[PDB]
Design a protein around this ligand. Structure first.
Ligand code: CHL
Ligand code: CHL
Ligand code: CLA
Ligand code: CLA
Ligand code: CLA
Ligand code: CLA
Ligand code: CLA
Ligand code: CLA
Ligand code: LUT
Ligand code: LUT
Lengths: 165, 39, 203, 229, 212, 217
């Protein structure tokens, strides 16, 4: 398919690796009882192994010569061959939660600078104000692009600068 | 009790509680959704 | 003031200027007088078409059981020939009612402005305009001599009764599967074993 | 002024104003006046239905024996259908009840006949209509109201006694009184059941099961059947 | 003056005696702040009222289970109701969430803004969803027989009785749970066993409560 | 006044004359998106456009989907209508999408420059004869002229009522379209079929039983 990679459900080293992990787990399994808790834990392990290999073969991942899933990081090639779930949807999910954390921290900083003890509200966290901003932070991309377009996202050149500049 | 809540509002206690919540949330998600790599 | 429920507190905007003003508005739908004007005119129009509907459902069935091109039930009037398909009759109906309906609406928008005949410009309705109550050629037999406080009230009472009757005919027909005078004949044959609860539980 | 306990004190909201006022309110359910008007009306209505009920059960057992009043609704027969009788009772009782309730909530607002505008009911008090409802009065209302509430309280107690005696013995009130006269020491509620910290015994229910009427299969349970002695 | 939970010790400064059931019992000082004490008063009343309703259900169904009526025992009652009726479990749980969340959220925002649910925004109702005190919502719906607006000292007596019966039913429900966890039986069966052998059938013979 | 929660505090940006005079104001901004008045103007416009296209879309779902259960209008399911129509059609869907992108982009840019400047699209000379009838009507998002032919917006004593009916029917149609998408992914049948199933057995056929919407139970 992409880059000479076969799909994992078509790959043979993928099936060999699945069979090898089952072989190691059953060689460890064959030295216990039946209803014993080590045997129960190893059968749960084998169930999770089979479920994991079936889910990775179901998700349409691409395997190499080693039988291991390879990820495709190109928006157009991923959206063309059905691989947006591995890099593209995770990167927009990450950027949503990372801007969430950063915007809630920025709103807490701006809220606590407007008092007579900003360092005291930085050492001892104002929990109601922090939870208020943490719930209100869900509209952070809209609020961020609005603060961008008003010219209030950015401080002017009243910043601290060195002698050189 | 007010002073005990101020002590619980201090920085390392909130870092401990919040990282316990975040780590437990990720642990719970990895238990009920075992081994996620995509989507 | 004859109440719909004696002793109850009636809405203050209802004053007896409307025909059949009995103070019945539990949902307070007539608070705005503009909406009350629209609802009064719509009550008149739905009531008069329902009176014509109940007459046109009763009288052919009242004549089908006694001693005449068809004795077909009222809800099977579409499956009859009528010298033409029903689509052409739909088109004719919509043209003539487009004319008449928009003429009534222009009277309701501007009262005293839809009175004279457009082609034969000597013919004219008189200046007793009263939107919803035209007069003139629409009262050809010289009635309205009475105050009409009484005749308007009889008109809205028979109209409300026929609106309830037509909501009847739709409901009774959709439940029993049959014709309303045969439903009344069953309720006269055995009223004690043929009730709404009897048939509903016989489902 | 006689009391429910001679020597005690009545509650402060009970003075002797209403008929049948003997100072009996341990829970204090009439300290609100707006509540007490509703409960006076409800007491009168429960008392009148219970008096008519005890009269019906007594005259029914006297006139027509081998018909058990707890099963008259089962073993009655009529060409009048059950849903037809229930529909007539539904509409006519909804009418009468809503007229009386409107007189309650608006005092003296449904006095006039709706069909015949000549006839108007005179001014009165709530619960005691008068007029055509009372064509004939023997004596004075200041004692007849007391007699009415006393007979009505006694008949409410009589009706719950009829229901419990019918569920425990299985016979009518006159037949159960004949049983208590045939064996007074041996046929009492003390003589049928007892609870001791060792063991407890309850009387068997004489009303069998879900009653098979004409396809409805009415379930017929006994009242608080796990809590009888 | 007033009887304290622990005779000899003075009561704390935040527990004065104005509240019903005020015995000065706060050794962990969980209600020093007046807003937190207000919220805990209302939580105590809600837990108590659910425990009274629950314990009456336990007792009546267990009486009807020992006397041969066919009532289940309360640790099997939900399963046999769902399985013997035509009831699916998660839809009944979601309908419970809907109704209880509506009512509960009305209670929440009347705690927050104290007279605000009597504005008429719910269907047309005004002053019938106004509260009387903290956790005492007596109008026409919640106090229909109307005992809170006549004989105020007797109503204070009823507040005292309500708090005492609620604490008694909370420890009774903790009872029923612990009794079932130990013996694996119905609680009125346990009461029958204690009436049979008081000296020999008890928690010192269950073999669980004291494992020595 | 009326609110989405009785007893909750109304946000201070939704309690001003400019916010209270808008349409459908119930104080619902818990995420605080409209604290900026320029943002609230832009979001008013975005709500109006999503309302109107959601009503038109949900009407195109429901009325063919209701009438296809009656006799006439054999119309496919709304998640199959694009395929059935493009089999019936003459053009490929790419060319049809390109034509609708150009034709929508023109009109959209007209609305965009009207949002930027209210008295903008009435330049004398910029249009052949459109230019006189392409100003606003003193309230942005509510144009006049060829839009609104029948003159229903002429009487001032009906005007807030028409506004509030529009914003309620629009929000309800947006809920309807999100429902159409959700039900389609969960059940696999059409929305009229979902309504027929909830009417046939309400206590057993719902989102608590479909095995998708809450899978913990
Ligand atoms: C060409 C533009 C034009 C349009 C859109 C109209 C529109 C109308 N004029 Mg018409 N007119 C127009 C030109 C003229 N009219 C008239 C003379 C009249 C008269 C005398 C009357 C009308 C009326 C009407 C109504 C016809 C009702 C109908 O047929 O419904 C058919 C059904 C439909 C569903 C289609 C309508 C939608 C309709 C609102 C009538 C009216 O309502 O006046 C109050 C009326 O009485 N017109 C003259 C000669 C002076 C015209 C000159 O070209
Ligand atoms: C406004 C009052 C009105 C009412 C209550 C009805 C009611 C009915 N007509 Mg209808 N019609 C009405 C106006 C008109 N019909 C017709 C022409 C017809 C025809 C030709 C037929 C009906 C039929 C019907 C039935 C539609 C049931 C169905 O499954 O359709 C869904 C199917 C389609 C819409 C196709 C129902 C009894 C049908 C019938 O009688 O069958 C029992 C039928 O064949 N109507 C015309 C002339 C255009 C009308 C004028 O306004
Ligand atoms: C980080 C840098 C980067 C690099 C090195 C690539 C590399 C590639 N892109 Mg990707 N792309 C990227 C980021 C990048 N992309 C980003 C950020 C986007 C979203 C804007 C895209 C959206 C995109 C689309 C829609 C497509 C590609 C495609 C490609 C492949 C061929 C095009 C090429 O050689 O242009 C060199 C790359 C750059 C100069 C970076 C800018 C990318 C621009 C914005 C898009 C280029 C698309 C191109 C015009 C389409 C060519 C069609 C092809 C059949 C000839 C190549 C592997 C095409 C493909 O699938 O090939 C099989 C394709 O259709 N890209
Ligand atoms: C920094 C690089 C990096 C990246 C990109 C990843 C990524 C991942 N790791 Mg790895 N890992 C890392 C470093 C990294 N890890 C390090 C440093 C260690 C040693 C401490 C590990 C040890 C480790 C273990 C033992 C496991 C992983 C697993 C995973 C997968 C977890 C998916 C998940 O949590 O469910 C999804 C999580 C969410 C949906 C939570 C986010 C909640 C928001 C609201 C979602 C919003 C979306 C819109 C994911 C592919 C798991 C796996 O199975 O890999 C395949 C796993 O078992 N990691
Ligand atoms: C049918 C219901 C009923 C109702 C609504 C009333 C109402 C009233 N009674 Mg009357 N009473 C009744 C039946 C009723 N009574 C019966 C059957 C008897 C004979 C035992 C009496 C004997 C009696 C006396 C001696 C007096 C009253 C008085 C009153 C008035 C004031 C007391 C009060 O406020 O409590 C309101 C009462 C209720 C709200 C009803 C109680 C409802 C609870 C929740 C049920 C508990 C009953 C319990 C299950 C026992 C049932 C019977 C048992 C043997 C099985 C009030 C109008 C006093 C009075 O007339 O002063 C003006 C007074 O002195 N009652
Ligand atoms: C209709 C089916 C039905 C059947 C077969 C039973 C059967 C029983 N009930 Mg139950 N009960 C029912 C419905 C039913 N109940 C309903 C709907 C309620 C709520 C009002 C109750 C409230 C109730 C209580 C409080 C108690 C019983 C008890 C009992 C048992 C003893 C008989 C008795 O006390 O009369 C039934 C008791 C009543 C107060 C009469 C109400 C029952 C009628 C049929 C309700 C009909 C209403 C419905 C909407 C129509 C018996 C097994 C007793 C028991 O042993 O529990 C452990 C007991 O203490 N029932
Ligand atoms: C109406 C039915 C009924 C009858 C006839 C009895 C009769 C009796 N009970 Mg019982 N009791 C009853 C209902 C009844 N109880 C109920 C429903 C309960 C549960 C609340 C009790 C709880 C109870 C206890 C705790 C005790 C009795 C005792 C007694 C005996 C009392 C003798 C006495 O003290 O004379 C003078 C007597 C046999 C006592 C006993 O058994 O002593 C011999 C005793 O200790 N009863
Ligand atoms: C049994 C003890 C008990 C007592 C003394 C009270 C007392 C009170 N309640 Mg409370 N309540 C209780 C149980 C009790 N309640 C339970 C279990 C619930 C949950 C259902 C509630 C839910 C509740 C609400 C929502 C409200 C009250 C209010 C009140 C106050 C005035 C109403 C009244 O006087 O009724 C007196 C109570 C009795 C006479 C108890 C009757 C005993 C029954 C009949 C036992 C049998 C029931 C069982 C199922 C069988 C008063 C302080 C109101 C208030 O605070 O107004 C300002 C109010 O709005 N209560
Ligand atoms: C005060 C204080 C103070 C200081 O500061 C500190 C300290 C000391 C800590 C504190 C104390 C505390 C405590 C003691 C607590 C406890 C609690 C409880 C027990 C509760 C319960 C509570 C309880 C509850 C609610 C309960 C409820 C119940 C219920 C509903 C039930 C139900 C049911 C029934 C009917 C039957 C069925 O079949 C089943 C069921 C379903 C099961
Ligand atoms: C307000 C606020 C505020 C605060 O602060 C925060 C928060 C809360 C976040 C917020 C909220 C939000 C929300 C809820 C949103 C939602 C929305 C929606 C739903 C939309 C839709 C929307 C929707 C829409 C538009 C839609 C439209 C549709 C359409 C056109 C359709 C079309 C069609 C048709 C006809 C048919 C064919 O065959 C197909 C198709 C093609 C398919």
């Amino acid at each position: 398919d992409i880059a000479g990679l076969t799909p994992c459900s078509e790959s043979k080293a993928y099936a060999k690796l699945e069979k090898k992990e089952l072989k190691t787990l059953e060689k460890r399994l064959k030295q216990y009882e039946a209803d014993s808790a080590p045997a129960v834990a190893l059968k749960a392990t084998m169930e999770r192994t089979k479920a994991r290999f079936a889910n990775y073969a179901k998700a349409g991942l691409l395997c190499g010569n080693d039988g291991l899933p390879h990820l495709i990081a190109d928006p157009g090639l991923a959206l063309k061959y059905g691989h947006a779930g591995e890099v593209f949807i995770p990167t927009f999910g990450f950027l949503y939660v990372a801007g969430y954390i950063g915007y809630v921290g920025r709103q807490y900083l701006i809220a606590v600078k407007g008092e007579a003890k900003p360092t005291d509200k930085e050492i001892i966290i104002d929990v109601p104000l922090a939870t208020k901003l943490a719930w209100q932070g869900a509209g952070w991309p809209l609020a961020a692009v609005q603060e961008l377009q008003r010219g209030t996202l950015l401080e002017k050149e009243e910043n601290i600068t060195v002698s050189p500049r | 009790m007010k002073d005990f809540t101020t002590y619980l509002s201090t920085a390392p206690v909130i870092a401990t509680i919040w990282f316990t919540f975040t780590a437990g949330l990720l642990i719970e998600i990895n238990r009920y959704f075992p081994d996620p790599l995509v989507f | 003031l004859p109440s719909w429920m004696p002793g109850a507190d009636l809405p203050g905007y209802l004053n007896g200027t409307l025909p059949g003003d009995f103070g019945f508005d539990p949902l307070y739908l007539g608070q705005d007088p503009v909406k009350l004007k629209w609802y009064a005119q719509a009550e008149l129009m739905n009531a008069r078409f329902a009176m014509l509907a109940v007459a046109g459902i009763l009288v052919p069935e009242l004549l089908s059981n006694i001693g005449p091109g068809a004795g077909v039930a009222w809800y099977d009037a579409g499956k009859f020939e009528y010298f033409a398909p029903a689509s052409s009759l739909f088109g004719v109906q919509m043209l003539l009612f487009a004319w008449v309906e928009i003429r009534r609406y222009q009277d309701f928008v501007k009262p005293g402005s839809a009175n004279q005949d457009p082609i034969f410009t000597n013919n004219k309705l008189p200046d007793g305009n009263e939107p919803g109550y035209p007069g003139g050629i629409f009262d050809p037999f010289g009635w309205s001599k009475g105050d009409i406080k009484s005749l308007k009230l009889k008109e809205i009472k028979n109209g409300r009764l026929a609106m309830l009757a037509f909501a009847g005919f739709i409901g009774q027909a959709y439940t029993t599967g049959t014709t309303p005078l045969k439903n009344l004949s069953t309720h006269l044959a055995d009223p004690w074993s043929t009730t709404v609860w009897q048939n509903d539980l016989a489902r | 002024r006689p009391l429910w306990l001679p020597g005690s004190t009545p509650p402060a909201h009970l003075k002797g104003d209403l008929p049948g006022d003997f100072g009996f309110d341990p829970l204090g359910l009439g300290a609100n006046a707006e509540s007490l008007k509703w409960f006076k009306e409800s007491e009168l209505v429960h008392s009148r239905w219970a008096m008519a009920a005890v009269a019906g059960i007594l005259v029914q057992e006297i006139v027509r024996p081998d018909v058990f009043w707890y099963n008259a609704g089962k073993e009655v027969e009529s060409p009048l259908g059950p849903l037809g009788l229930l529909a007539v009772e539904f509409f006519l009782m909804h009418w009468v009840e809503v007229r009386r309730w409107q007189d309650l909530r608006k005092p003296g607002s449904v006095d006039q006949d709706p069909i015949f505008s000549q006839y108007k009911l005179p001014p009165h008090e709530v619960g005691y209509p008068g007029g055509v409802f009372a064509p004939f009065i023997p004596g004075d209302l200041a004692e007849l109201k007391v007699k009415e509430i006393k007979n009505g309280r006694l008949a409410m107690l009589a009706f719950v006694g009829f229901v419990m005696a019918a569920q425990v013995t299985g016979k009518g009130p006159i037949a159960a009184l004949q049983e208590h006269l045939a064996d007074p020491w041996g046929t009492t509620i003390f003589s049928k059941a007892a609870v001791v910290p060792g063991q407890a015994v309850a009387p068997p229910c004489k009303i069998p099961a879900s009653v098979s009427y004409k396809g409805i299969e009415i379930p017929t349970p006994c009242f608080l059947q796990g809590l009888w002695p | 003056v007033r009887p304290v939970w622990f005779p000899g010790n003075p009561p704390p400064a935040h527990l004065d005696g104005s509240l019903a059931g005020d015995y000065g019992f706060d050794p962990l000082f969980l209600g020093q702040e007046p807003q937190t004490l207000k919220w805990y008063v209302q939580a105590e009343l809600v837990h108590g009222r659910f425990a009274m309703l629950g314990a009456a259900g336990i007792i009546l169904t267990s009486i009807g289970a020992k006397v041969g009526l066919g009532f289940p025992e309360w640790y099997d009652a939900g399963k046999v109701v769902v399985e013997k009726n035509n009831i699916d479990f998660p839809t009944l749980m979601v309908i419970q969430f809907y109704l209880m969340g509506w009512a509960e959220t009305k209670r929440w925002y009347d705690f927050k803004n104290p007279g605000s649910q009597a504005d008429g925004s719910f269907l047309g109702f005004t002053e019938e969803f106004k509260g009387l005190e903290n956790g005492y919502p007596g109008g026409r719906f919640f106090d229909p027989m109307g005992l809170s607006r006549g004989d105020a000292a007797k109503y204070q007596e009823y507040k005292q009785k309500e708090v005492k019966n609620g604490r008694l039913a909370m420890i009774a429900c903790l009872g029923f749970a612990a009794q079932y966890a130990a013996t694996g039986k119905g609680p009125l069966d346990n009461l029958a066993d204690h009436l049979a052998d008081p000296n020999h059938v008890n928690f010192a013979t269950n073999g669980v409560s004291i494992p020595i | 006044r009326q609110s989405w929660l009785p007893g909750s505090q109304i946000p201070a940006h939704l309690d001003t004359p400019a916010a209270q005079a808008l349409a459908g104001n119930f104080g619902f901004d818990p995420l605080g998106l409209g604290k900026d008045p320029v943002a609230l103007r832009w979001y008013q416009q975005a709500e109006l456009i999503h309302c109107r296209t959601a009503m038109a879309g949900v009407a195109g779902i429901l009325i063919p989907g209701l009438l296809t259960k009656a006799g006439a209008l054999n119309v496919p399911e709304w998640y199959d209508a694009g395929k059935v129509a493009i089999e019936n059609s003459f053009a490929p869907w790419g060319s049809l999408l390109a034509v609708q992108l150009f034709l929508c982009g023109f009109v959209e840019a007209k609305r965009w420059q009207d949002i930027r400047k209210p008295g903008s699209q009435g330049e004398p000379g910029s249009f052949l004869g459109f230019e006189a009838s392409l100003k606003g009507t003193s309230e942005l998002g509510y144009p006049g002229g060829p839009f609104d032919p029948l003159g229903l917006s002429k009487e001032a004593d009906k005007w807030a009522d028409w506004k509030l009916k529009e914003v309620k029917n629009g929000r309800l149609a947006m809920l309807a379209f999100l429902g159409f998408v959700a039900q389609k992914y969960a059940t696999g049948a059409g929305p009229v079929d979902n309504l027929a199933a909830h009417l046939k057995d309400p206590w057993h056929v719902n989102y608590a039983t479909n095995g998708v919407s809450l899978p913990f139970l």
